[PDB]
Design a protein around this ligand. Sequence first.
Ligand SMILES: *[C@@H]1O[C@H](CO)[C@@H](O[C@@H]2O[C@H](CO)[C@@H](O)[C@H](O)[C@H]2NC(C)=O)[C@H](O)[C@H]1NC(C)=O
Ligand SMILES: *[C@@H]1O[C@H](CO)[C@@H](O[C@@H]2O[C@H](CO)[C@@H](O)[C@H](O)[C@H]2NC(C)=O)[C@H](O)[C@H]1NC(C)=O
Ligand SMILES: *[C@@H]1O[C@H](CO)[C@@H](O)[C@H](O)[C@H]1NC(C)=O
Ligand SMILES: *[C@@H]1O[C@H](CO)[C@@H](O)[C@H](O)[C@H]1NC(C)=O
Lengths: 286, 284
Amino acid sequence: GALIEHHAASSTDQPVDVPYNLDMFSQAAVLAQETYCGEQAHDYGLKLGDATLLWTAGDGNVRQRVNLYQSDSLGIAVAIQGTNTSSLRSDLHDAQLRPVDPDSRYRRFLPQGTKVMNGFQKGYTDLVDDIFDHVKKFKQEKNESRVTVIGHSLGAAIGLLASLDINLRLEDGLFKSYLFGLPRVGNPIFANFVDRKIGDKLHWVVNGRDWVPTVPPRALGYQHPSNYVWIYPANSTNWKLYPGQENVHGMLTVAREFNFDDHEGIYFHTQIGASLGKCPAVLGGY
Amino acid sequence: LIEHHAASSTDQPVDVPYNLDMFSQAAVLAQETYCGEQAHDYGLKLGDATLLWTAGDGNVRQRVNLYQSDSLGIAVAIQGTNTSSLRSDLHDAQLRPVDPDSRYRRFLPQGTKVMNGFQKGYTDLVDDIFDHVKKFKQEKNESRVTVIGHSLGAAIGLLASLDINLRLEDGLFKSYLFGLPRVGNPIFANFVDRKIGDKLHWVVNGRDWVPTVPPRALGYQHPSNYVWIYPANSTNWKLYPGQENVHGMLTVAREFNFDDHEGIYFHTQIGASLGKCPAVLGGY
Ligand SMILES: *[C@@H]1O[C@H](CO)[C@@H](O[C@@H]2O[C@H](CO)[C@@H](O)[C@H](O)[C@H]2NC(C)=O)[C@H](O)[C@H]1NC(C)=O
Ligand SMILES: *[C@@H]1O[C@H](CO)[C@@H](O[C@@H]2O[C@H](CO)[C@@H](O)[C@H](O)[C@H]2NC(C)=O)[C@H](O)[C@H]1NC(C)=O
Ligand SMILES: *[C@@H]1O[C@H](CO)[C@@H](O)[C@H](O)[C@H]1NC(C)=O
Ligand SMILES: *[C@@H]1O[C@H](CO)[C@@H](O)[C@H](O)[C@H]1NC(C)=O
């Protein structure tokens, strides 16, 4: 249709050592994986690391599966199910890709001109009311003010929206966010806002030459938030943090030499992937 | 989405190995394409180059000026445009990747695609260019043919350079392109490198937007080895090897402007609202 002529930042900052607690990142990883376990979905009481399963909705068909835990280190942890690269390759076309206004439940908290990808926001708005209801319920039952949002893949995209929304609309806001294989979600206005409001809480990681964080493309006006960890090579222990947005020393340096395999793999010693991790999911070991 | 891959070279930039006298000589001819009153001043001389023939008027077809040049031979310079015009017209059907025109399609790999708007710009002129290149090569006893262009003219120029090299006896001597937009897909870009890579010289000025469009996300890929003048209009220039070099233009990903398209390229001014008419070689 038309070329996006808006500018956007591409950071030139040098990559730094990853400063985060990787036990917590790993704990998030095993929960991200458990979202792909259908038979264990309503196994309430199941414990994965420090996190005990309390509630689940969705099934990966009409709505993404969401699993909610009490976790010693993460508080009330909400993990959202992702998908695989062949589903994303099939589904990301046409109306899905449209940059749209924020849903009315949270539109008034975000800058004017904020846009997010239609299919990702839809994935979120189909779950948001049940997530909010059950977060509030279990925060009250467990006397827990901390809320962590976690997700891989489509789950990471839904997760970014949930993390920002929870931080703006729910009392106590967000504690942490942990996102794995994150697609682009919104425009530069969105990305700057994410940085401003949840930048100090947000943790996200890209595995090697994963295609997923290259889409939707910058040419459609989409922009990542700041500071991703890049695991390179994929599945290795070689990780660094790439400051600012769309860092030129990172992903950008291979973004037309992607593959469809690195999306699933080993993230900080834990397997994540619909075809890869086990059920129930195992923490660490790789 | 375009799920096809494409190369993005990681090779370090190197010094520019080119004869810059010839690149500047091209630059004054790229500018003269913008001079409408002088379009038919046959005999006019700019550097080592004498005007022999002109077609087009910038309205229905781009202006093309044809010279005899001591250093470049029969030189064909194609008029470009300004960033404002490109911002307005690069939409919808103009951006579409299309098959090569039947005149040259069988010479190009299967799967080659070029931007529809730029190919139309060329195919509106190609027959007149071919006829007159042949006419003046024979009249001047000249086997060297050089193609030159800025802006849209650089895009039309790239197609001409390849087409001439494949279809015309003696092929191409040199190509000099300034502020080159993307023109075709990776198959095109690879083929350009294979067939005219050792003849091709092209340069981007600073944070010029034009060489960022059309986007890679629509399937477009630059050929190898651009000179980058950075900052814009300065004498700091390096060559960026391979295609879509990650150390170059891509490092100012999305922080373009609409002003560097016109400016100082190897000491000579190029741009529709910036030169003199007649154009001046060097001085800046
Ligand atoms: C990182 O780990 C993943 C998961 O083991 C690897 O994915 C496999 O890659 C091969 C080809 O590269 C495919 O044929 C398999 O189907 C993939 N498995 C899955 C479950 O996707 C990936 O290749 C690894 N990447 C690197 C760079 O080692
Ligand atoms: C390089 O040269 C060109 C010479 O025109 C500069 O373009 C001008 O820039 C100013 C400030 O942005 C604009 O207001 C003018 O309209 C531009 N002129 C034209 C004809 O486009 C360009 O800014 C210079 N760039 C650098 C980095 O020095
Ligand atoms: C990917 O996920 C889809 C949708 O759930 C499923 O039908 C398919 O079996 C999966 N593909 C692979 C290769 O595992
Ligand atoms: C750009 O070029 C076109 C020629 O079609 C002209 O009409 C327009 O006024 C020019 N714009 C500027 C800013 O020089």
